[PDB]
Ligand binder design. Sequence first.
Ligand SMILES: NC(=O)C1=CN([C@@H]2O[C@H](COP(=O)(O)OP(=O)(O)OC[C@H]3O[C@@H](n4cnc5c(N)ncnc54)[C@H](OP(=O)(O)O)[C@@H]3O)[C@@H](O)[C@H]2O)C=CC1
Ligand code: SF4
Ligand SMILES: [Zn+2]
Lengths: 182, 68, 114, 474, 90, 370, 126
Amino acid sequence: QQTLPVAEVAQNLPKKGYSPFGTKQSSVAEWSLARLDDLLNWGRKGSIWPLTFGLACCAVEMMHIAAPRYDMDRYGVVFRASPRQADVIIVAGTLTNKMAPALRKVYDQMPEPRWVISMGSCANGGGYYHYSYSVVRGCDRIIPVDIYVPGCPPTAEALMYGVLQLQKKVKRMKTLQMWYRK
Amino acid sequence: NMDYDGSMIPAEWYGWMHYKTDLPPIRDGCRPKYKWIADHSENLSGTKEAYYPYSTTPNKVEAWEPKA
Amino acid sequence: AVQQVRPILSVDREEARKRALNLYKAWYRQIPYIVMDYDIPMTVEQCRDKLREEFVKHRNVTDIRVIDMLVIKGQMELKESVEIWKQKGHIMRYWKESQDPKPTDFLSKFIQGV
Amino acid sequence: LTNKPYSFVARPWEIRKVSSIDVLDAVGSNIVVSTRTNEVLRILPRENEDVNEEWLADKSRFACDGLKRQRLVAPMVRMPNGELQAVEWEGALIAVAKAIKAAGGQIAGISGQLADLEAQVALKDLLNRLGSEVVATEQGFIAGGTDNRANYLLNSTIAGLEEADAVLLVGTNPRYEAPLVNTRLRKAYVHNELQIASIGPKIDLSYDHENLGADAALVKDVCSGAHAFSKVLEGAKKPAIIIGADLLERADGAAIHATVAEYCKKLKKPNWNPFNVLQTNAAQVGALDVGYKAGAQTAVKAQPKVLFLLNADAGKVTREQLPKDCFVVYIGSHGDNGASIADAVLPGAAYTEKQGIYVNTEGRPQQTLPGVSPPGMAREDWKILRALSEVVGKPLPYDNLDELRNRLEDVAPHLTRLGQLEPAGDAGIDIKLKELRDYFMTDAISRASPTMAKCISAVNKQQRENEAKQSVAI
Amino acid sequence: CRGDIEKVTHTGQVFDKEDYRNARFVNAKRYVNENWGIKLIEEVPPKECTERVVFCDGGDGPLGHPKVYINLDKPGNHICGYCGLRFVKK
Amino acid sequence: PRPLKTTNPAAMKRGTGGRSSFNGIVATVFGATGFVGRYVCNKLGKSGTQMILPYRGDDSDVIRLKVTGDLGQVLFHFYNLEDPASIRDAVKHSNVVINLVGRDFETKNFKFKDVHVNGAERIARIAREAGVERLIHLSSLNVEANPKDLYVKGGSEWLKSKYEGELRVRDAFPNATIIRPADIYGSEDRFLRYYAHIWRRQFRSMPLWHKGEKTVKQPVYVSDVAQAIINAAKDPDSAGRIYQAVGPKRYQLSELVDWFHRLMRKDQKRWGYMRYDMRWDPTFLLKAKLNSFICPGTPIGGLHPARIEREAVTDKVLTGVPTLEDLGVTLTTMEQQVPWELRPYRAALYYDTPSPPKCIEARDELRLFA
Amino acid sequence: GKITVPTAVNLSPISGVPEEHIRERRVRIHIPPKNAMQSGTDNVNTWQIEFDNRERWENPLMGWASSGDPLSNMNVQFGSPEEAITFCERNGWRWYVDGAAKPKKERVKNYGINFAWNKRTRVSTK
Ligand SMILES: NC(=O)C1=CN([C@@H]2O[C@H](COP(=O)(O)OP(=O)(O)OC[C@H]3O[C@@H](n4cnc5c(N)ncnc54)[C@H](OP(=O)(O)O)[C@@H]3O)[C@@H](O)[C@H]2O)C=CC1
Ligand code: SF4
Ligand SMILES: [Zn+2]
């Protein structure tokens, strides 16, 4: 790892700023595309709409970020039932062999950009039914997954930590800078 | 600023912030403070310095080298 | 070498063959509805060839209860094919898609380790 | 007391137990192999009252460390530079096929110390289909003993040797050649009033015995009746005479095999065959069952252009006896010796990595089972020989192991009844193994093991320690 | 150059330069613990005792290893098989 | 006798042949986010091949390729084509490098010479300096030293660029396999989607060069060329051999386009399907030039003039140069696969099976070109 | 309402076994070996069938052992060899028996032979 910086060292460090790219771009067109990508990523991270895809027990914790203690609504996060209106699909439960074409069709009808959160050990790696005859060995064999939330029923702080990690990934998305360098 | 997360809390204040104990490390002396205790690190996943697994045992079957 | 059992869905081999012909007739009538109602790459003639191949795979059986078991499972798969409960991936599981054809010669199995 | 090679390695519930046989000694002892996650952990005795009786020799047990060191993982072809290089399977097979076509029917093949029965059958079928009528074995035997089985069998049962009354050892040390036979003789020593005489040098049998001498012709005195032990042998209820295979390899050989056989025809009891031979090689009895011409000199004197070898590390054949150009193909698992002189070092699977038959010294066929996968790209030896026959152009008719067992029924009906012994009829001085450090490194797997080297180092350290403490008092 | 790839672990394992499995570390750090147990158990001094048999608990009672008794009649350092602490009799 | 490189017994071929097995190949598919890259990535991941997969743009365009392989068999690496150190970091632990880097239109940062000529030569020389055993590079079928224009002026720069890039690849990497596809059809392609788009048509009528009768094309499926790439990577007798990647039967463009419109249910009389000559219509070329101008990224439908000159150039096979049937792949016929591709592209039926197209033999092609 | 059938059936089509596993797998019918470091025998009296070992390889990513054989971990218990023969012929498996059980080993254990006169069975320790 790295040691987290001591406050004597960290007082000499300057402020990071909001932009992961920095304001030190050379060209004015590159700087304008950087700020446009910053505004676009702020709009995308300011409201991600996850889809009501609750397969198994993990989803009982998924409603617990809907719950008044954790309150996902002040993070841009609000559930949508239709897959067209939703940004994120949260695979929260056990993907089985009869569940595989349904999950693939629901993911394919979702419009791009598409970030996928694997909630729980049945969602990533198979988990407690990994050696079962009718359980897919994780959802990574079917749906491409950006965030993997570890706990068997993830606490709801850990699922919301996965949500904040997805927001940091969305804030780190480089589209217009790649277009300028394509 | 704006890059904070839930893993910036070190190990000694983690139980104080999560209501396990009501004793801060400035008053509690039960903490070990040993020599080999590594400093705290945030979740480094998604960056160019994250952890990637590997086999930890060495090679079991030793081949035969025509030389020697 | 002879035991008395309770018959399942048949009492003689001619009756069991007749009900297997009923199953083949209903499958043959349900082929062009399967090609029409599913988004599969296989055509009607390929579906009929696959139906003939799956019947001549089970041509070898002789026992009345075994062939009635096969007829019962075939009618259940057919009832899962008339009412659309199977998907496009379940229909295309008869053709072994996404599978490399394993060689039969000893040399290619010796090189590949099989 | 704990297994020190198996120190802290695994746990009993973690172990997959596979039933097989051991090929290091002559007993053909039933073992259970501890395989967990493609690794040989340890070797434990398996219960059979006829063969091993829940015991195991040290060479049989502590040879599991030799399955990791000096293994063959890639096919190696000798380059024109002068050193072997790792070559893919198709190139090695067509190189051996090109050398076979350049030889033009002047080929020969020698069986191994640890070779499988099915590998020997595949080698014999490949050589007979290619116009070669000569096959060989590392350990020699008498002339004309192949025709009758009782010439080369321990005809008295290992389970029956505990009922012996007077046994004579003709130039062998059974506690270092096949120690479970010595456990049976020790049980018959303590339970029955047994008198044992040994002809040869001074050896310790872990029980008392009368040493008649190292002279050869004294055994003729045992066949004369004038010797004192001959009266004990004729007066015994269940007598026996055991002859080592190294004494049968010498130039007198068949003569010493003949006379005592006549003595056995002078002393026989119903349901008891007193003639006994103890041959250290596990592959020797199976090779002489399927019709191998015993002796490496039979393949040396034939002057082969391509000399096939199975898992043979005895070193009885070298480059000096071979001609100027000789494509030596070594199909083995370890290759400490016999692979440095080879031109096409083909890999192979060990006895814990393949399924095959081995016939022990009493003539009882047994089947080993594959515990772990072979390392690298090593294959089974009969599969290698069948693929080589398909590359050459005269393929063997069997494709899998079942038709190979059917051809085994075609050549010998008693080579497939595994675990069942068919008794044969009538049969018609220096010891190389006399110390423990000689006993430790006889085979290739025991030579590659570091445990046997550690044992010889510890025994030699105790020997110099005792010699220094004895010589400091002088 | 990166020095975290060729560094050996306490189990004696390192990926050599001809291995294909070092391509997984071109974007991620190879995690090697710098606190080896061998040096950290060789650093502590042995404990001198006068009685013939001693007991090792490894620390606190319910928080340590199960209690073992070591006989110190043989000269030398006797190592506890649980914690690795060495005892010696004068 | 082909020698082994490293003889590491944790690096040889093992397993039956699924995802969890390993076939001893470490692939580095350059430009794997493209159309051929998806199919070759799935074909490599279904056999057990670890892929390094260098990507140039965003992570969201390449994160869909993690489902092709098993755990640890798919890596990702950020690179630029002008940066040589990132390519050397990408290929330093590989033995098979597959080069799919290409672009059908000129870009403001990368020209045709900067992609096909300079970039492929740079990748080939970096792979040669990095000890890569085998390289697979893709070209066009009708590459010539001096290819002439047929309809559009300034055309055939793509064919000349691919020929010069192929020559620089064989000058840099000597044992480089050159597969030459003619025109690759399939899903999300630039052939069936380009003939399937609204922007290609002009008032329910498709312009074609000499009404599509003069040009004869032999298109190939993307799974066939992916299997050809894998069969060239596994079998080591394909070192430095040019493989003509063409389909089973020759077709002319008019019968192909009429068969496509029969598949999309455009053959009904209320739709008003009409095939007419392209050389009489300068408005279509003006529309294509304006579409290449105003689009910031890729043009819509791929209606750049390079695609126009590519559809103008007929597919010519070379005698004595091997075809994919020498690589041991059974080529899929057109009539089995194409109705499945054009099934979602069918029009709505008006309120008021299609015939298969006629193949063109050698003597009929010689009569047509006389 | 009963019919006449042969008592030997083949249930390999109606089961889920594919052709690549029913055509080339050998079933070993055996008594499992007693652990030689234990003196108990309660796990020995049950016969069982097992399948032949297949290729197990090192994982490319981690050090785990991977196998494509689905039947490596399936041992089926039986009370007699003949019922296992009937099961193997009913399910269409290709069978073989590793070995029959030992019928009887007649042994005598006398305490008086440890201390005997003019006998070689006298012990030296205690
Ligand atoms: N019709 C066809 O498909 C035919 C194709 N070919 C050849 O086949 C090959 C593959 O074609 P195909 O996949 O269909 O085409 P694509 O354009 O769809 O794919 C090209 C790939 O290369 C990448 N790429 C493009 N330009 C650059 C650059 N400057 N630097 C780095 N990477 C770059 C693209 O990345 P990104 O995701 O950013 O776009 C994409 O992954 C090409 O060499 C082409 O010339 C030949 C004849 C016919
Ligand atoms: S990962 Fe754990 S909590 Fe989540 S669905 Fe599976 S068993 Fe339930
Ligand atoms: Zn302790």
